[PDB]
Design a protein that fits this description.
The complex is a heterotetramer, with 1 copy of chain A (126 residues) and 3 copies of chain B.
Chain A lengths: L16 E5 L9 E5 L2 E3 L6 E7 L2 E7 L14 H12 L6 H16 L16
Helix pairs in contact in A: 1-2
Chain B lengths: L12 H16 L1 H7 L6 E5 L6 H11 L3 E5 L1 H9 L5 H11 L3 E5 L4 H5 L8 H11 L7 E5 L19 E4 L5 H11 L13 H5 L5 H16 L3 H9 L7 H16 L10
Classes of the chains: A alpha+beta (126), B alpha/beta (269).
Chain lengths: 126, 269, 285, 192
């Protein structure tokens, strides 16, 4: 149980089992789960990625969102990498090289190409 | 003046319209461009999976406007780079300048970038291309179409306004485009009416133009020893040169290009 | 001499004042300079987001002084670097000396630094020759060096020292007045319906660089041209088949509305943060 | 062919690609064909690639120009890429000819199994292949003990597109061959 937002919408922190029907699947739940203020047909994958810049080490885990029915909530290496670099190296010149590096790393990691395997993030609840 | 026409690529209506607007309109109606005070776009940059008809698109648009077509293959650019012979780029443009109107097509603008992998994204050959494009008079109808299988590694300075500013995504052929490609490939060979040429295109989803060409070549090479059985036998050897993982890069690059345009709601008072 | 005036940008009043001080006073008031014993500044370096009008600023200041303007783009620097022909720098300055007073402009002083990645040092052949020529200048022929860099961090510090490009000027994205001026300059010599509220268009394009606004105007003109061509083609298939009011005499409001659909900000908030942090670092010193 | 025992399918493919165009130009034209400009071998060293090329040349009575690895490397050293032109000219003079590159990967090997994958010598080889007229029946037969490091650009249609396996060292080639066959799993297409 969680707090409510007045109108009746639960706070629904990351990974919660929402009340919306899962248009997609591969979850055995039949409901859209929650992540960063949005509803997704299935839990995102996750993999660590190293961000090296100015001698700074960052242990940031990228959350991939492939296998999404709406075809609009699916992840995007360019957007994801831009967000990561901006969040961890805001306003630093030459960050585009780091963004390209992160894009390549995410593409390689997500290119395991075993669509049968999914590895949902380990989150309690459905 | 290529003999390739739009029917040889089939679909890509949006790309066809953009190419028309960028080539046919300035050449056919310079008066309207002068009236509206718009400078015609100097160039365009096709990006997409390998062997999807980028060269075919350039040749088709050249044929549509009946403009001379000059193809600068990637091996030529690498020859310039390895031998430090970038200066010849100048005369290459001069050639395109001489055969005006022209559609100067660079098959692989990223060939040099790929060949390099510590340095930046600037190289002597691409720098010469940039200098020629900047120093090119817009009065002469010379259009540069730079294909690229790696839209990111390409030098950003080439996408600057006044250059190959427009980026066009050439996706894998769809069902209609695949049917058109198969028909064009099987145009100089005797093919029996038994083969539908549409059901095949329907099944071979995600097959680049090169894949369809290889399938047809295998089928009619067996026939050299055409019928439905031989097409099926060759199709057993069919290979998808581009996998969905490769597609993702281009699909999501185009998606992020389109999402940046988030001012469509703008309405005047 | 450029034809660009300050109305083409119509913004950055402080930058205009500074440029007048360092380019206009020495050529307009030599008496004051020799009386006060203050050496004229050799040059300035504009740093800001891409397509923010740095070239426009240089052209406008050159036009105001009625001084010859010759611009050296980054591709030229890269040509002189790859070919190991840095000696050309010399003749370039000579040309600037010949057309005195002159405003030498380097579109991308960081182009060579970028080409090497932002294992060696920060000094290179072409920039070294530029420094050598700047030092070996008459200092009274009134030749002003206005470098322009999108990446001020990787600029060789030797360039940013007293007596050589001492002043760094931040050319930010245009403000509302600057955006209005840029739009008016772009739609100049173009037929735009008088009901097109360019003031509103500038108002709703916060964060758009000058290049972005030029792209918007070009897209509007392109849409108008496409509409004109389509109407002309429509004239036949109705005439010559079933045997005149101009379809599109001006770029109407709908054209700009549709153009704004393909309008994107080439300078994200992160880049603005980059440049603002650099300026803050310079100022807090 | 008796010099090599076995590899019946290899000979099948070799003669298919070489003998027919020289012997039946009319049949190829009837079907509107562009004969493959070349082919690439790959397998354990000393498996008979050179003698296979020689045998197919003998069956066709076509001259067999051999460019060994040392020649390609010598072209690489000293920036002698231009010599490639001459080699193809030497191949072109022999109208029915088989041009054999004993080690296409030798230069890629020398650079190390920092740059990309293209190099001046292979670049000139590609340029000559692209500009080689189909009327002159010159067949390029590349050979590589390490097909993984071979430049991908040379395995493109209009170039040495076909790859033939010429059989802990073997497992590498077996896995490579499977990787060239695992995704060919569309052999079920049946016409209606």
């Amino acid at each position: 149980v969680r707090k409510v937002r007045g109108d009746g919408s639960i706070v629904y922190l990351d990974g919660d089992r929402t009340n919306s029907r899962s248009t997609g699947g591969k979850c055995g739940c039949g409901f859209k789960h929650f992540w960063d203020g949005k509803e997704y047909d299935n839990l995102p994958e996750a993999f660590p990625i190293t961000l090296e810049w100015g001698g700074r080490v960052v242990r940031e885990t990228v959350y991939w969102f492939q296998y999404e029915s709406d075809s609009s909530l699916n992840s995007n290496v360019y957007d994801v990498a831009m967000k990561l670099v901006t969040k961890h190296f805001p306003g630093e010149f030459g960050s585009e090289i780091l963004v390209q590096k992160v894009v390549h790393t995410i593409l390689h990691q997500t290119a395991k190409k075993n669509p049968d395997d999914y590895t949902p993030v380990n989150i309690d609840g459905a | 003046v290529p003999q390739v026409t739009w029917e040889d690529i089939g679909g890509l209506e949006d790309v066809k319209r953009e190419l028309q607007e960028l080539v046919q309109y300035p050449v056919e109606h310079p008066d309207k461009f002068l009236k509206f005070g718009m400078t015609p776009s100097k160039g365009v940059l096709f990006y997409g999976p390998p062997g999807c008809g980028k060269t075919l698109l350039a040749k088709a648009i050249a044929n549509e406007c009946q403009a001379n077509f000059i193809s600068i293959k990637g091996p030529e650019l690498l020859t310039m780079w390895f031998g430090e012979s970038e200066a010849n780029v100048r005369e290459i443009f001069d050639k395109a300048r001489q055969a005006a109107p022209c559609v100067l097509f660079f098959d692989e603008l990223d060939s040099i970038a790929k060949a390099r992998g510590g340095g930046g994204a600037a190289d002597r050959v691409i720098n010469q291309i940039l200098t020629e494009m900047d120093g090119m008079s817009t009065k002469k109808n010379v259009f540069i179409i730079g294909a690229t299988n790696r839209p990111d590694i390409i030098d950003p300075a080439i996408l600057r306004p006044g250059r190959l500013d427009q980026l066009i995504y050439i996706p894998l052929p769809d069902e209609k485009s695949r049917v058109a490609i198969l028909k064009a490939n099987l145009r100089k060979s005797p093919v029996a009416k038994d083969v539908d040429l549409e059901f095949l295109a329907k099944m071979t989803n995600g097959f680049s133009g090169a894949d369809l060409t290889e399938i047809c070549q295998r089928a009619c090479k067996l026939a050299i020893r055409i019928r439905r059985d031989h097409f099926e036998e060759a199709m057993r050897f069919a290979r998808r040169s581009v996998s969905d993982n490769d597609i993702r890069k281009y699909e999501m690059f185009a998606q992020t290009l389109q999402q940046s345009r988030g001012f469509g709601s703008f309405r005047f008072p």
